Design a protein around this ligand. Structure first.
Ligand SMILES: Nc1nc(Nc2ccc(S(N)(=O)=O)cc2)sc1C(=O)c1ccccc1[N+](=O)[O-]
Length: 304
């Protein structure tokens, strides 16, 4: 199958980055002038082709309609490639945080971004959609002050892994503890954990739990939040990958974790990082938190 109209009209302007299963580019329509982001996925064609299950999941994502979610414009299968075409935004949150090294990020902007991300997540969760892969590079910002959720993860990946991608370990940094301990089905709480890690990263300008392996990821979480036990997390000791031999670290206070964040922010962050998924705050309850009583929509000073 070929899609020659799309292929000839759109020209790659630059490569944005790589991911486990796709390469991302900025492309510009030769005809109009429209710019989009393209995710190019190479298909196996021997074992998978375009899986039907994947097409149904992608179709569901394409129907997601919310201002804080990047719009999937089209899906194009051509040759042995699948291209996902997205609404283009100019910068991701990782680049913005790096660019803010000498200036810091104003608290009102951090609060606005967290509020917007929670609105996008509350919306998705209410429609039975999990993001599953929240990290700074998957959060996009525009000059008007908006931030949007991008690169939603599928329940089942497909395509040939990108050999030039070497940053897979970063995905562990935002992974909820229940996933690391072996849960089978992810709940909406996994996205709140990832967003909590990102909130701490916006405030401190350093990743909260930068593990170098799955066990190191778990131990970095334990070193800060304390090794979980049956009191703080009922049922934890029975999880598939839980080991009685885990070292027992005592919990640290959030005042040392995200200085100089205010008490409202620390309270919210602590609820987003609760060990027990059943007690972790929901996106909706988070929107209702006192931290957001004075939220506004400032604009970033983007240099592009
Ligand atoms: N829509 C959209 N816009 C982008 N622009 C952008 C422009 C500049 C930068 S940067 N490093 O700050 O200069 C980063 C992103 S990426 C993107 C995505 O939808 C996307 C995002 C993450 C992973 C995969 C995809 N993806 O599948 O297309």
């Amino acid at each position: 199958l070929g899609s020659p109209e799309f292929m000839e009209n759109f020209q790659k302007v630059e490569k944005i980055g790589e991911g486990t299963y796709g390469v991302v580019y900025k492309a510009r329509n030769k005809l109009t002038g429209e710019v989009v982001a393209l995710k190019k996925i190479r298909l196996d064609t021997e074992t998978e082709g375009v899986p039907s299950t994947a097409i149904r999941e992608i179709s569901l994502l394409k129907e997601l309609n919310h201002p804080n979610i990047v719009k999937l414009l089209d899906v194009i299968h051509t040759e042995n490639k699948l291209y996902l075409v997205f609404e283009f935004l100019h910068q991701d949150l990782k680049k913005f945080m790096d660019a803010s090294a000498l200036t810091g990020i104003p608290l009102p902007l951090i609060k606005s971004y967290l509020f917007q991300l929670l609105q996008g997540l509350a919306f998705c969760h209410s429609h039975r959609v999990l993001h599953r892969d929240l990290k700074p590079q998957n959060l996009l910002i525009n000059t008007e002050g908006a931030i949007k959720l991008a690169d939603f993860g599928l329940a089942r990946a497909f395509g040939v892994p990108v050999r030039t991608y070497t940053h897979e370990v970063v995905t562990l940094w935002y992974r909820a503890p229940e996933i690391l301990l072996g849960c089978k089905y992810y709940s909406t709480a996994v996205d709140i954990w990832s967003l909590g890690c990102i909130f701490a990263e916006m405030v401190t300008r350093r990743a909260l739990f930068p593990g170098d392996s799955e066990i190191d990821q778990l131990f970095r979480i334990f070193r800060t939040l304390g090794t979980p036990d049956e009191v703080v997390w009922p049922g934890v000791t029975s999880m598939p990958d839980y080991k009685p031999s885990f070292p027992k670290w005592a919990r640290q206070d959030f005042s040392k974790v995200v200085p100089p964040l205010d008490e409202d922010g620390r309270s919210l962050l602590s609820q987003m990082l609760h060990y027990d998924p059943n007690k972790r705050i929901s996106a909706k309850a988070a929107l209702a938190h006192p931290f957001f009583q004075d939220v506004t929509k400032p604009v970033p000073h983007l240099r592009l």
